[PDB]
UniProtKB/Swiss-Prot annotation, chain C:
Core subunit of the mitochondrial membrane respiratory chain NADH dehydrogenase (Complex I) which catalyzes electron transfer from NADH through the respiratory chain, using ubiquinone as an electron acceptor. Essential for the catalytic activity and assembly of complex I. This is NADH-ubiquinone oxidoreductase chain 5. It comes from Ovis aries (Sheep). The chain crosses the membrane at residues 31-51. Signal peptide: none annotated. Core subunit of respiratory chain NADH dehydrogenase (Complex I) which is composed of 45 different subunits. It is found in: Mitochondrion inner membrane. Belongs to the complex I subunit 5 family.
UniProtKB/Swiss-Prot annotation, chain F:
Belongs to the complex I subunit 4L family. One of its GO terms (molecular function) is NADH dehydrogenase (ubiquinone) activity. This is NADH-ubiquinone oxidoreductase chain 4L. It is found in: Mitochondrion inner membrane. The chain crosses the membrane at residues 1-21, 29-49, 61-81. It comes from Ovis aries (Sheep). Gene3D superfamilies: 1.10.287.3510.
From Swiss-Prot, chain G:
Keywords: Electron transport, Membrane, Mitochondrion, Mitochondrion inner membrane, NAD, Respiratory chain, Translocase, Transmembrane, Transmembrane helix, Transport, Ubiquinone. One of its GO terms (cellular component) is respiratory chain complex I. InterPro entries: NADH4_N, NADH_Q_OxRdtase_chainM/4, NADH_UbQ_OxRdtase, ND/Mrp_TM. It comes from Ovis aries. Belongs to the complex I subunit 4 family. It comes from the Eukaryota. It catalyses: a ubiquinone + NADH + 5 H(+)(in) = a ubiquinol + NAD(+) + 4 H(+)(out). One of its GO terms (molecular function) is NADH dehydrogenase (ubiquinone) activity. This is NADH-ubiquinone oxidoreductase chain 4. It is found in: Mitochondrion inner membrane. Core subunit of respiratory chain NADH dehydrogenase (Complex I) which is composed of 45 different subunits. The gene is MT-ND4. It holds the Pfam family Oxidored_q5_N. It is a multi-pass membrane protein.
Swiss-Prot record, chain H:
The chain crosses the membrane at residues 3-23, 25-45, 67-87, 96-116, 122-142, 145-165, 178-198, 200-220, 237-257, 274-294, 325-345. It is a multi-pass membrane protein. The lineage of its organism: Eukaryota, Metazoa, Chordata, Craniata, Vertebrata. It is an enzyme of class 7 (translocase). Pfam families: NADH_dehy_S2_C, Proton_antipo_M. The keyword Mitochondrion applies. GO terms for biological process: mitochondrial electron transport, NADH to ubiquinone; mitochondrial respiratory chain complex I assembly; reactive oxygen species metabolic process. GO terms for cellular component: mitochondrial inner membrane; respiratory chain complex I. Keywords: Electron transport, Membrane, Mitochondrion, Mitochondrion inner membrane, NAD, Respiratory chain, Translocase, Transmembrane, Transmembrane helix, Transport, Ubiquinone. This is NADH-ubiquinone oxidoreductase chain 2. Core subunit of respiratory chain NADH dehydrogenase (Complex I) which is composed of 45 different subunits. Interacts with TMEM242. It catalyses: a ubiquinone + NADH + 5 H(+)(in) = a ubiquinol + NAD(+) + 4 H(+)(out).
Amino acid sequence: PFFDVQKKLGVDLDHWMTIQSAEQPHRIPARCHAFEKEWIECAHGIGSIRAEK
Amino acid sequence: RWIARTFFDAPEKNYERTMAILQIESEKAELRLKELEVRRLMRAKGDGPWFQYPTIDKALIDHSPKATPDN
Amino acid sequence: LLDLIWLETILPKTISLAQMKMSTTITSQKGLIKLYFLSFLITILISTTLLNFHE
Amino acid sequence: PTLRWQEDPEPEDENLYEKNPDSHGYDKDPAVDVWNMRVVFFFGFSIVLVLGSTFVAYLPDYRMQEWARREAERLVKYREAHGLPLMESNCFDPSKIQLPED
Amino acid sequence: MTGRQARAPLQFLPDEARSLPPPKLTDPRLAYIGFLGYCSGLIDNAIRRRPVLSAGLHRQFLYITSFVFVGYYLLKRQDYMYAVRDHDMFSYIKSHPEDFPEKDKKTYREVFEEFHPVR
Amino acid sequence: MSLVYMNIMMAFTVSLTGLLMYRSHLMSSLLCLEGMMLSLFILATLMILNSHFTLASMMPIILLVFAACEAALGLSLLVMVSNTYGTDYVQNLNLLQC
Amino acid sequence: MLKYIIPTMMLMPLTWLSKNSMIWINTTLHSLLISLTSLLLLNQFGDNSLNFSLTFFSDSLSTPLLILTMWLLPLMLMASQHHLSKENLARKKLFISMLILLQLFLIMTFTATELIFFYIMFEATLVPTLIIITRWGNQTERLNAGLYFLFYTLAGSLPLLVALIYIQNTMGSLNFLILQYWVQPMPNSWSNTFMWLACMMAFMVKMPLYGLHLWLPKAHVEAPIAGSMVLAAILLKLGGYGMMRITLLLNPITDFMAYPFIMLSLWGMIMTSSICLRQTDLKSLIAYSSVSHMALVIVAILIQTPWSYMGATALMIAHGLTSSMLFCLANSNYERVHSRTMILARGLQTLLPLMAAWWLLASLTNLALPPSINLIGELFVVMSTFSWSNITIILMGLNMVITALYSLYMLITTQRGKHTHHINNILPSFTRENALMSLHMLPLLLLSLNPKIILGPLY
Amino acid sequence: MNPIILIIILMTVMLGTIIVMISTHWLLIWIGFEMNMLAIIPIMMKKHNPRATEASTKYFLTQSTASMLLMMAIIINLMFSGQWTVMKLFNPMASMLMTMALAMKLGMAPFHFWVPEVTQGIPLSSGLILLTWQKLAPMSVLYQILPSINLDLILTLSILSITIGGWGGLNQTQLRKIMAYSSIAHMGWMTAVLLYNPTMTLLNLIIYIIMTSTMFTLFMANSTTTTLSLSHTWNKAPIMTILVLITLLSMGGLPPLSGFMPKWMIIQEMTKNDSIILPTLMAITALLNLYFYMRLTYSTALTMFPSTNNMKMKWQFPTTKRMTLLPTMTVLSTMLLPLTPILSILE
Amino acid sequence: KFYIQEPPHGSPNWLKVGLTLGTSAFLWIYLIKQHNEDVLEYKRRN
Amino acid sequence: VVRDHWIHVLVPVGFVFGYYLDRKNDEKLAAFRNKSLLYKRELKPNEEVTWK
Amino acid sequence: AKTLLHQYWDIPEGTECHRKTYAATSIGGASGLVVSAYSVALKTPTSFLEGVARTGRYTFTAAAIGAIFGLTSCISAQVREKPDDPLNYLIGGCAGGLTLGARTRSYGIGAAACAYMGLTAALVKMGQLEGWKVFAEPKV
Amino acid sequence: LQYGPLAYILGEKTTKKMTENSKLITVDGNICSGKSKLAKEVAEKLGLKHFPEAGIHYADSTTGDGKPLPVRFSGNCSLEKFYDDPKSNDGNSYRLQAWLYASRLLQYADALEHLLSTGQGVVLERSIYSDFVFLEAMYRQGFIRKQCVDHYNQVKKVTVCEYLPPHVVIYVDVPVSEVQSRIQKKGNPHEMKITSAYLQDIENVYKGTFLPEMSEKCEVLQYSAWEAEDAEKVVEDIQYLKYDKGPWLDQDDRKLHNLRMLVQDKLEVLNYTSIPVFLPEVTIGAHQSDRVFQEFTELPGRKYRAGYNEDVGDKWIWL
Amino acid sequence: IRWTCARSANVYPNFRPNTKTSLLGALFGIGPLIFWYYVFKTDRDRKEKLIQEGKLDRTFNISY
């Protein structure tokens, strides 16, 4: 399955590697920063299928 | 008369037992049909709290002044 | 003629011999490795370009 | 030069007779033999078969029989007294129907 | 059926399961679990060549306790699961009633059936 | 897409065919696995550099150190085979039949 | 009903915690007291079935067969010695407890409201019977017999599960009443044809019908007496019971789609009565007798008359008793002379003198003795099928002629004419054998007196 | 070997599976599969026969090419929509190669030739750990990527796996190839349900793992390789017979016994869709694989073979291993029919 | 008595049996305390 | 005399326990105590219950 | 593939003949390519010319099954004039099974292939006619 | 047991019970000639714990009661019937052969454990290698069909290739007429009835096959006939050699740990005794085995694990 | 004993399905079955047509 020890222990020790819009080590963006931020804030609290809608 | 008196049950007890038991299992059948309808429409549209596959969290999304404006 | 010989041929013998022949064609693999990887390769190619799975 | 085996030609075909000539069918212990004939020929016949015979001999009106006799007698006396036809057809009233039409 | 807002991980009994009653003492399913623990101890006597139905009575007591305890917590989880399934279902029922029609209870005076007599 | 990406994927799939069909030795097979490692390395690296996705730059170096120790395990196994026989052919593996 | 289930549970550790040479009396006495408490069930009246403990209910399709099981258990418990008395204590106790668990899954099968519970307890009836016949078969093809047995019964009865699940989630629940009181008539498209053919084909396997019948006779002739009797009587009449239950749905298509099984059934009835006219191996004739009766039962269920259903359940109960008894007589002759063939053990009127009375009585109940329950069942089946069609009576009467002929052949060839006078090991008949003859032929004659107990719910 | 070294290596196999179960980043999944391979190789070759050398060689080549093909799938996923979230892929090609990576990983019928070869040439402990854990961990991966699967993949691989794992097994008299063919059969049952209701698949996973642990403990009652050795297990012990009976028929899956709970609920919440021809075909082939279980049963626990002296010499001595966890898994693997409402224990 | 040179066990250790009885009685007392707390929590909430 | 030979008590204990358990279940299932449109009479006169 | 089976099921059945036969020969070419690919992948033919002979044999048998089955499909549908029965394809599956047995030059293989291919072809048309969904819902 | 991994983790090694006291010596002569005279001498003058000759009822006297069980169970060898008639085709030679092989292997494994724990090294007599030499010479007389010789060869292939060959083997040569004089002046009549060319074949194979095929694994000491008692010579020759050959150089702890856990749970040793090949002189049908097995459970000690056994005691079956 | 094993279960080995065996099999099995099928369809169609006329002699025909 999938567990949420990443969530319950609280220390997001892998959620920094994951996407852009985080602590890039010296604060620069990537090439497509604002597109990712817009699409994530489009489909954030959405149930993944009306997100596709 | 004695076999009636000591070993059996009245048709009252039996009859109201059957009526109660039919009403119970009728409720069971109608709940199960409504369950499968809700499941099929909920997998179709997705407007319910069941089928929500884990999307992107926004707490790891940052916004703070970068080194290049035109992102 | 009707019960023993024909009914035992048509339901037990037919099914049993079909499964036994499929066994003797499947498990009779000589123990080589190039053969199994060529099976893997043609499985990949016949899944891509002929019976599509990427659509 | 070939045997394939080590066992005896087995067994001796012991008929249970010639050693306990008053025995019943099963094994030779002569107390429990009497106990077995006891338990089947009392608790299989004398309290099972005959009691089941009395218990199914009389019981209620099985599938409501003599009730139906007396109910039929009352209803046929009623129907031939009060002039009405005995066993009218159309068991549901056709006033309570809405047939499809053309 | 995935999350269902797991925030709040697997969380073997959540905070919300304390609103339904627990399974009672001597409920039949935990009694089944206790009998199965007894049979587990008996076959545990049977694997080794120790005599069965004796010489393992502390192990009988341990196996019965372990199984009854674990099955008790599992029954608590099960009751939580079915309660939350019905709660989600009736919440979505009350969400949009206009898309779930309540059909007309037609009496049999007007419901026609094609007859086809069985001879 | 681009032009370079088609050629790197073409190189990958040719390396994959060289991995799958292989004739006599096993060293050449493990060496083609190393070439496939190189292809995945170069592909992920050019992706991350062209994105300027500076954050997860861990991918290529950690991919290669891990598939390197995969190849180390493989060389240990192949030298074990060549010890317990004369060569490292695909023959001598003909026992343990299906 | 739960008061009829739970002492069968508690009767299982009886044999375990009773010491040696004491288990026998305990199991006999206690299972007979269970048989009394079993016959106490009969409260059924009039309007409804008696329904309780929501999984449980009793028709009169279920009351007489349930009493048949809970009375045929201790008879069998007594019946199955002299062939395992010399076996060990562990395998003895295991045999007895396996039979008891077989009874428990049988009663669970016969009081099944929910048809998924019915199917689970159906193959639960299957699984110990294989272990019984395969461990104590006392012949050399018993292995192949058990293998054929399980694969036929499973692979026939397997898609029945899928069809019942489809019913469960296209209509609602599977209470038998809510299967009733709600059943919509289903039209004649092809999927309805497959669903009907699935359910009917599963139970056609179980009865058997003619085309799937070599399932049975190997499994009968290569089995111990306990497995043979439970197998024949209780399993085949269980298949009939289940068909009587499941036929309440799919009514308006089975007229159109239930022709060819009638033709297969009747021609198989004549061919089965003819194949048991000329075989050796005395044990096999009763198996083919069972196939003849069950083909007649299948005709009775495919027609849908209350006359047909009353004759069906009477034929079930009567042939269960008759074929179980005649199996026991065959076992007694085989334990007299270790042969299993027929023509070796001629004679036997002179010696074992009142054994002849029980061969006579069992064979005349097979004959359709003129007040017997067998005759009542076959007669109402013949009446109902004559109303079905005016031409079927030739096959019925020709069945009657050949049935009388092989019954009389079995009577006057195995047990008539000349002792072969090179035998000298046959004893006088024990008291246990005559006790089992009595325990078979008292309930059949008592039911011959007052039979309105055991006729169908279409009364 | 040292027991220190084996406790370290078993800890790392556990660590690889926990990293695969636990992460939200694709590189961590790939490193988990690799570390699982790296540690699981020296559990094999605990002895030093050429059988184990060839078996670990075959397993290494197939497993490593599966892992590199998985990394190819991840890199296609980020050539497209670029983020390291373990979720719906964004290419049918990436999903195609990813399912074929898992189909090479845990054994499916196009990709299954290595499984009986590697399970015969090793001792039973290595086979135990490989079947249980190596078929536990990638099901987590499938459970995480279920919304973006072309169903023709799982359908084809599942049906073909059931029928190949069925038809193989009629000929094999070796115990380990029987057990691997049973493994591919349950991989078909555990994979075909996946795009419908995955709680069924994960419960089937727990069922299969408990069953196979019981089976390998019973074949570690004494080191047996053929069926003839099991007839001698009859002659030396009576209760191993009846447990081989009950657990073999529970691998067969009959309704009074707890191996029927995988078939039963899956057919239910399979045909609350309207796939019916596929379930009934799967259940017919499920009837097929029960035959070699049944002939093993007929070989040992039901008939009795001729046997050998010096078993007289073996009668005195105890069978004095420690069985790792035998009784709990036996009566939890067989008597667990009346707890099918412990399906919903899972989510 | 009657045994020669090898009782491997059966001479009863007393660490493990007391440990089993103690942990099992403790586990019972914990679950009964848990069940009482659940009943009182239930009648407090409702 | 029960302690002497105690084997012959087990199935009456099982039956009487099953009888009581059916009694408890019938006490559980009994709704529609007078709510039938067929067996609907005024309860009289002693105490509070007409069938059980 | 999806494309050629869709070509086969596009034409009404019905009389738009011999396109059916050509599509069924394409079915035969695909089936022969599959079987021949696995067979030469798992044999080591020794040598390649004999492998060409084996592939040609399998493709010729599968194409012949397709051709004969399409011909008898079209002819039976034209004669009986009822484009909805499955019995014409029952006859077609038996005819294809007999010709498979004759090219393999036996009797029992031909008769069992007649029975099983006829019943499965009946199931194919019967499910396409009443409506049984191809390979998935995949919904619930 | 107080073993498994945890014993090797806590208790350090087993190297510390080594060496030059603890060792494997094995005295091998011909029949009834180099007997426990020389073995008891080297045990009592070398400080080294003795194990007796491996007869038949060692399996009887090795566990539980030391009273020997009758030949229906522990046989069916009938050793004096072998010495009288080693030609009857009822099966009396190979059965005895394989039983003696299992006996030798059992007492060899037990002596290996008693070496690997506590010391002090053991003297074996007529070990397993002499037993395959016995099968070789017994086939030279032509008593057993070649198929069954191949069966014993297969048992020898599987069993012996898990162990360590011992340190030293004291070969003792006694010539034909001297062994024949000793056996015809002993007194056992069924030993009086032995033949002489069988003894000759023992001599011929026991020279020409044992002594070349040692090759400094099992460092040999070849002694003459009357070179017995004569004890200081064998003591000084054991002491004053040096051990440089054979696999007993380096183990170091891991091999010894594996052998300690392989010798314990003795069914691990005996898993490879029954192959089976089905050997029409060896196999027994299930009926005889089942009635003998039930009668073996009827013996007052063997029934369900003598550590727990009732009717001897031990008043602790936990109430 | 020998004749019993001959007549009972040594029928099937040996057996090859020949022209004679198969033709006589398909005659003796399917033939009378399809014959009775035709006669039962005949009588049932006659009966259904006659009662669809309305003039069946059901003057009283209760026990059906």
